[PDB]
Each structure stands twice: as C-alpha cells, then as structure tokens.
Amino acid sequence: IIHLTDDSFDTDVLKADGAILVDFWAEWCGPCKMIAPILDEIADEYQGKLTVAKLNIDQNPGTAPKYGIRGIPTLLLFKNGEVAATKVGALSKGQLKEFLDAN
Template identity: 60%
Template sequence: MPKPYPARYRANPNRKGKIMSSELIVHTGDAAFEQDVLKSDLPVLLDFWAPWCGPCKMIAPILDDIAAEFEGRLKVVKINIDDNEATPSRFGVRGIPTLMVFKNGDVVATKVGALAKGQLTAFVEASIA
C-alpha cells in the first residue's frame, strides 16, 4: 500500500474548494484557467503535471520553494493534465512536467522536463524580469 502524501500536499478544506500543494500554490482546471492564469495580475508559473509522473513529483517541493521565494511577485499554478485535457491541448503540451510562464495572459517562456532548483529559479527570474 502506498504511503499517504505528507500533510502539506493534501487538500486544504479552508481554501474555497481549491486543492493546494502548499498554501501558496493554486490548483486550477480547464474551467478556472482563464481566471487563475490568463487574467492574473502577477506573472504565473504554470506546471502541467499528472499524479503518475515521477519527474512531476520530484519538482513539487521545488515549486513550493519557488512559490515562497517569489511570493508577491509570481503566482504558481498547477494543472493536472489527466483531469483537464483542453488546456494542455490548447498549449501543445506533449510531455510533462511542462512549465510555462505567463505575463499579461501570454506565454513568455516554456521548459519541458524536471529542473533543479537553481535552474528553475534562473528560468523564473529571466522570465519575469
């Protein structure tokens, strides 16, 4: 039997129906994508992921760190590609994890595959500058 996820990765019932990886990460879906990502006042780092994806699990704690480090300057959002097929299709996602940075509703940078924290930090800093 698999171990349960640590408490910080479980659903938080106090967050208006959104499932959170941490208090700073928003999980979105096809229906809420426009509001959560395209209409965001802050730049958005969007993670296309799936629960069965090993590299996605590897970068999850790094995304938590990025969300904390860039709080107030960047919004970190995750979308499960198994539960939401329209958005990955719309943006041509072919592999996961795929990370995209959005500014003012437009994709300004994309990376496919797991990144180390230093690489992800540099990617974000260059993308939101």
C-alpha cells in the same frame, strides 16, 4: 499552491495581473513528483513577484493541447494572457531560478 481546472484557467491564469507559472502534471509521471517539493520553495521566495499554479492533465484534459504541450512536466510562464517562457522536464531548484530571473 493554486490548483486549476479547465473552467478556472481563464480567470486564474489569463485574466490574472502579474506573472504566473503553471505546472502541467500527472500522478503517473515520475519527474512531475520530483519537482513538487521544489515548486513550493519558489512559491515562498517569489512572493508578489510570482504566483505558482498547477493543472492536473488527467482530470482536466482540455487545456494542454491548446498550448502545444509535448509532455510532462511542463512549466509555463504567463504574464498577461500570454506564455512568456517554457520549461519542459524536471530540473534543479537552481536552474529553475536562473530561468525565472531572466524572464
């Protein structure tokens, strides 16, 4: 489980080798808590293939506005320093996979 700050985003996400999934979230977001246990399973089954990161938008208000986030939870797939795909809202552990499989 990788926690991020605004200061660490550059190195952790953008300068990163290999694919990375970022969960922009908050404590006061019902649906965000819903997928917290789901995201842990993917951190196992996509070992080496993916790294899973989290950014809490309350304590780090600087990053989300840069990416045009419309709400939370927002899953962002990064490859180099680039957004590959986007998932908005809480979802099944199965729809998440089909999303990861194709990109």
